[PDB]
């Protein structure tokens, strides 16, 4: 018996068996359906037609707003993708802290009702990548396509008082690269356009170590500027934009929002535990998900945190090149082990005790 | 947000220990551990934990990642048993060997109570408490390990 593990993440699924170094299955959580008004397409293939179509993310800041799509979204990653019978594969599902609760009831709803799973559980994202990362203790950034997270961890527990959570991350990043480009006089619009910025975004920005700096190196001369090829042929040249786009983590008013910026709400976070810790937490910051892979971000947030801290603090931030796997990885160790699956909800357990048991069983 | 309408309200409660509690219970590795005062070695080996000879206690392989649980008596009690729990990390282990250590780690701190006070000891990183457990020339380094249990995606 191989366990499945299921990272839904808002932008990409990654999927896999427990054991696996990495996940086999990684696509687009998106279904595209006819721009003018099969029904509908999933994943790579919908990527692949959209010009035909218009992509819609059944998860939105981490919450799965479509149900009838992410349900489409689960049957392709095992019957399209892995090609396994879900009723022969316990499975593990991750989510983001500070989630409604009504949404992992509904996951596991359809886990057993409609997948008809042998076992299931819900596990929180960040507390997978600190294990991935081979600690007990340290706090974690997470960062991918909805929501940024902040989880202090001690001796193997989440410290809940302390977790942050801002909504966010990726997609509000691409959005703001699609709105800044218009000042070059590019129009990107279209949900389809929006993946290719989203593109552009991943090849081509970066975290500058000072921000004012940056923009007038980008005024004195052209050194900052990258070409990128659109799928049409044409040549765009992007410059400031390479670095005004993330730096919106840093100045979440670059999109209007009065929120605190990552390297703040780390701060925050840690503020938040127990000060006998703090000097554990502040030496294992770990990064994990897409929207840390920035170049740059690493340095970045050691320059502010540092500026934050106590002046004699030592400061550590740990970027694993697998990061945007972490989640998954740690899920495919855990998922490894007889103990933790031990923990997880049995189809019989659903049948009596119905969704409210996620509640009882996962931590 | 509102911790209560969210899906980690249950986070830090007894019934998330409760939990924990019963599946350390399904590890043969940890049943008369921590029985007398001492130190217990475990290496993690493709997955699983398993025992180390005493007659190997101090020595450890560069590949791979340990657990060492430290039982002894606290300054408020002779008779009674404290714990420090050490997972040492080698500087070649695999990412599932060390992720292993260290949820059974924290396994083997539920099976206890919650009384071991947890530390992490990548070689070379060692702390004073780890150094000390050992006899004069009683630490040694050894080349290899065993293999990861990961399967490796191509
Ligand atoms: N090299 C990169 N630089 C900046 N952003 C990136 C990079 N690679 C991926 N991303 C962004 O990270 C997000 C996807 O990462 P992932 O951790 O899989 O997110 P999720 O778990 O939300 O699906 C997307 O917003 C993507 O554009
Ligand atoms: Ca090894
Ligand atoms: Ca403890
Ligand atoms: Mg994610």
Redesign the pocket.
């Known amino acids: 018996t191989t366990a499945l593990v299921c ?1 839904n ?1 808002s932008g990409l699924v990654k999927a896999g068996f427990a054991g696996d170094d990495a996940p086999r299955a990684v696509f687009p959580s998106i279904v595209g359906r006819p721009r003018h008004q099969k029904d509908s397409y999933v994943g790579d293939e919908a990527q692949s037609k959209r010009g035909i179509l218009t992509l819609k993310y059944p998860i939105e800041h981490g919450i799965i707003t479509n149900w009838d799509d992410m349900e489409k979204i689960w049957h392709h990653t095992f019957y399209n993708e892995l090609r396994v019978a879900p009723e022969e594969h316990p499975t593990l599902l991750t989510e983001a802290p500070l989630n409604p609760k009504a949404n992992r009831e509904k996951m596991t709803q359809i886990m057993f009702e409609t997948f008809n799973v042998p076992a299931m559980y819900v596990a929180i ?1 960040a507390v997978l990548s600190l294990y991935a990362s081979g600690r007990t203790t340290g706090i974690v950034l ?1 960062s ?1 396509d909805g929501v940024t997270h902040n989880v202090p961890i001690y001796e193997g527990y989440a410290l809940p008082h302390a977790i942050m959570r801002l909504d966010l991350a990726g997609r509000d990043l691409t959005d703001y690269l699609m709105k800044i480009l218009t000042e070059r006089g590019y129009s990107f619009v279209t949900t389809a356009e929006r993946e290719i910025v989203r593109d552009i975004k991943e090849k081509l920005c970066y975290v500058a170590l000072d921000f004012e700096n940056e923009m007038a190196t980008a005024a004195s001369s052209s050194s900052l500027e990258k070409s990128y090829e659109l799928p049409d042929g044409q040549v765009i040249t992007i410059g400031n934009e390479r670095f005004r786009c993330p730096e919106t983590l840093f100045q979440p008013s670059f999109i209007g929002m009065e929120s605190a910026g990552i390297h703040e709400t780390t701060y925050n976070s840690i503020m938040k535990c127990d000060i006998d810790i703090r000097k554990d937490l502040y030496a294992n910051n770990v990064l994990s ?1 897409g929207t840390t892979m920035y170049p740059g971000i690493a340095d970045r947030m050691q320059k502010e945190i540092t500026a934050l801290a106590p002046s004699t603090m030592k400061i550590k931030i740990i970027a694993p090149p697998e990061r945007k796997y972490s ?1 998954w990885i740690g899920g495919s160790i855990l998922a490894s082990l007889s103990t933790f699956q031990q923990m997880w909800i049995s189809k019989q357990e659903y049948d009596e005790a119905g969704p409210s048991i996620v509640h009882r069983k996962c931590f | 947000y509102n911790i209560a309408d969210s899906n980690i309200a249950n986070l830090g409660t007894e019934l998330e220990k409760k939990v924990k509690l019963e599946a350390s219970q399904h590890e043969d590795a940890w049943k008369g551990a921590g029985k007398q005062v001492g130190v217990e070695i475990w290496r993690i080996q493709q997955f699983k934990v398993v025992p180390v000879p005493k007659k190997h206690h101090g020595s450890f392989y560069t590949g791979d990642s340990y657990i060492v649980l430290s039982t002894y008596h606290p300054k408020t009690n002779p008779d009674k048993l404290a714990y420090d729990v050490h997972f040492w990390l080698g500087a070649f282990t695999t990412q599932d060997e060390a992720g292993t250590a260290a949820y059974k780690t924290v396994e083997l701190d539920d099976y206890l109570g919650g009384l071991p006070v947890q530390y992490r000891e990548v070689q070379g990183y060692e702390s004073e408490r780890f150094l000390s457990l050992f006899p004069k020339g009683g630490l040694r380094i050894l080349d290899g390990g065993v293999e990861t249990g990961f399967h490796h995606v191509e």
Do not use: P
């Open positions: 990272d993440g994202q997470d991918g998900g989640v």
